[PDB]
Amino acid sequence: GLKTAQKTLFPLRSIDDVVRLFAAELGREEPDLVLLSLVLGFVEHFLAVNRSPAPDPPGGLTYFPVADLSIIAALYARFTAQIRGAVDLSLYPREGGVSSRELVKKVSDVIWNSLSRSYFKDRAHIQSLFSFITGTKLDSSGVAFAVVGACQALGLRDVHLALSEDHAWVVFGPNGEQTAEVTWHGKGNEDRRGQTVNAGVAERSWLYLKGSYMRCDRKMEVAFMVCAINPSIDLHTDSLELLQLQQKLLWLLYDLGHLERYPMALGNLADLEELEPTPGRPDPLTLYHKGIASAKTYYRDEHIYPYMYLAGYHCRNRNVREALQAWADTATVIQDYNYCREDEEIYKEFFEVANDVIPNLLKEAASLLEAGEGSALQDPECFAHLLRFYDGICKWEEGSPTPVLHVGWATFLVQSLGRFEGQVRQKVRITFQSEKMKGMKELLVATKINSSAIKLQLTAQS
Ligand SMILES: CC(C)N(C(=O)c1cc(F)ccc1Oc1cncnc1N1CC2(CCN(C[C@H]3CC[C@H](NS(C)(=O)=O)CC3)CC2)C1)C(C)C
């Protein structure tokens, strides 16, 4: 059950009251992950439903589901009783505050065997302990989080959440040195539960970030559950309340220093600030840049999303040069990876950028340039950024177990090259890093673009 100083903050009657509860918990050495995830999940569950003076409020209504101590305490007790009842700590000797792999596996198995047998893996709003207790449903990373929360409930202070850019697992033991898979990844893959992440680090997949993944402390685990808030009511509509809650909570974490080592949280906060700026706060650009700095400082500059977030912002704001520079930087990070069979999410992002986002942005620039009959299409550095993007993709492909490029990429390459005049392309002086680009260096800058030669080269077996 809950401590006395946890109870006095209830009932929660607004967003600010939730924020106050997080502020109180984050002031402790062990914020209570269970309590906090239960609260977020309760609030999400009830806010993420569709639902002379005007007959109805003319701007609609905002809502809050009051959260009574009696409701939240009961859910909390059900979780802690289930985990405590299922794990007998006397059977798992525990010297030095290090958990054994056997204990971690047992706690993992308790969570996993509790889950409903059939539900869509990509279902919204099943990320929190609320969903686990009240619906026995958790999404992939929600399983990992729940394992960590269960470990906290058992007093296992060394078990922590590990995150890549697309997967989650647990770390434990003397220095966070041990690792265990506890959940599934993607669709129709074969599961590795109970295994270490060593094969994934060695393979140099994006999915394991070559070992430069996030090893959370308790305050970062709080930051994760905040990032996991899902404001979506449906495809075309968001809860403003849940956007505000996530935004306010991320500022609280930011002020406390808890996003220092969390690039993706800083991108998420930048995106929210663009949508609804908070008076007196840093602008979105400052925050995207802080996320890149965090990745450079703590993660060897081996993350992709810090640069994708920045590129997205520039793209949405029609800053053609800056967007291309940021995508060039994303490719410069990916080139030092091998493309592996569970990296499909970042393949999809590169694909989309090369075959949809860049072509649209350059088409918009071309309309601007026509109307004015300087443009980014007249800037050789823009062209050089486009080339660096493709060069990094070709270099990513090199030595990978799955090919990346195929004929479907070639038509959009040719069209994007053609957006820049010969005289502009010919100003550049660059030595490519990939074999594929080196083998067409003359074609890329020739006055007449030879599509079929560029296609052959781009699709050559690497
Ligand atoms: C928070 C967590 C539950 N989420 C994860 O996807 C996640 C799960 C993991 F196990 C391990 C990592 C995970 O990712 C994150 C962990 N912590 C914070 N944020 C995360 N993510 C933000 C993320 C999704 C949204 N994109 C948005 C971004 C916008 C601009 C776009 N730029 S572009 C392509 O237009 O040029 C790239 C995509 C960034 C990455 C994943 C949710 C977002 C579903």
- Pocket of ligand 1, candidates 148, 224, 264: which has the most ligand atoms within 8 Å of its Cβ, to mutate? 264
**For residue 170, what are the β-bridge partners?**
161, 180
Q: Is the CB of 274 under 6 A from ligand 1?
A: no
Say if residues 335 and 432 touch (Cβ distance below 8 Å). Answer: no
Among 428, 422, 421, residue whose Cα is nearest residue 381: 428
CB burial readout 331-357, b (16+ within 10 A) else e: bbbbbebbbbebbbebbebbbebbeeb
The Cα-based distances of 77 to 35, 111, 222 in angstroms read 10, 16, 20
Give residue 60's identity as a one-letter amino acid code: G
Report the run of H or E that residue 5 belongs to, with start and end: helix 4-7
Q: Is the CB of 72 under 6 A from ligand 1?
A: no
DSSP state of 166: S
Helices (H) and strands (E) in the chain, counts: 22, 6
Cα of 403 from ligand 1 centre, angstroms: 24
Rg (CA), the chain: 25
Say if residues 33 and 225 touch (Cβ distance below 8 Å). Answer: yes
Structure token digits, residue 198: 């060593």
- Position in ligand 1 atom list of the atom nearest CA 167: 10
Cα of 344 from ligand 1 centre, angstroms: 14
Is the alpha carbon torsion for 116, 122, 126, 128 positive or negative?
positive
Strands (E), 16-163: 160-163
**For residue 160, what are the β-bridge partners?**
171
124: left (phi over 0), alpha (psi -120 to 50) or beta: beta
Q: Is the CB of 309 under 6 A from ligand 1?
A: yes
Residues 161 and 179: their CA atoms lie apart, in Å, by 10
Cα of 267 from ligand 1 centre, angstroms: 9
Cα of 165 from ligand 1 centre, angstroms: 7
The residues near 296 (Cβ < 8 Å, ≥ 6 apart) are: none
How many other CB atoms are there within 10 angstroms of residue 281's CB atom? 13
- Pocket of ligand 1, candidates 145, 148, 163: which has the most ligand atoms within 8 Å of its Cβ, to mutate? 163
Say if residues 260 and 77 touch (Cβ distance below 8 Å). Answer: no
Is the alpha carbon torsion for 442, 446, 449, 450 positive or negative?
negative
Say if residues 43 and 102 touch (Cβ distance below 8 Å). Answer: no
Q: What value, to the nearest 5°, has the Cα angle with vertex 315 and ends 311 and 321?
A: 75
Q: Is the CB of 166 under 6 A from ligand 1?
A: yes
Is the alpha carbon torsion for 441, 442, 446, 450 positive or negative?
negative
Among 12, 21, 10, residue whose Cα is nearest residue 47: 12
- Position in ligand 1 atom list of the atom nearest CA 327: 36
Secondary structure in 3-state letters for 336-360: CCCCCCCCHHHHHHHHHHHHHHHHH
Q: Is the CB of 139 under 6 A from ligand 1?
A: no
The Cα-based distances of 321 to 53, 165, 361, 384, 444 in angstroms read 50, 26, 10, 10, 19
Give residue 21's identity as a one-letter amino acid code: L
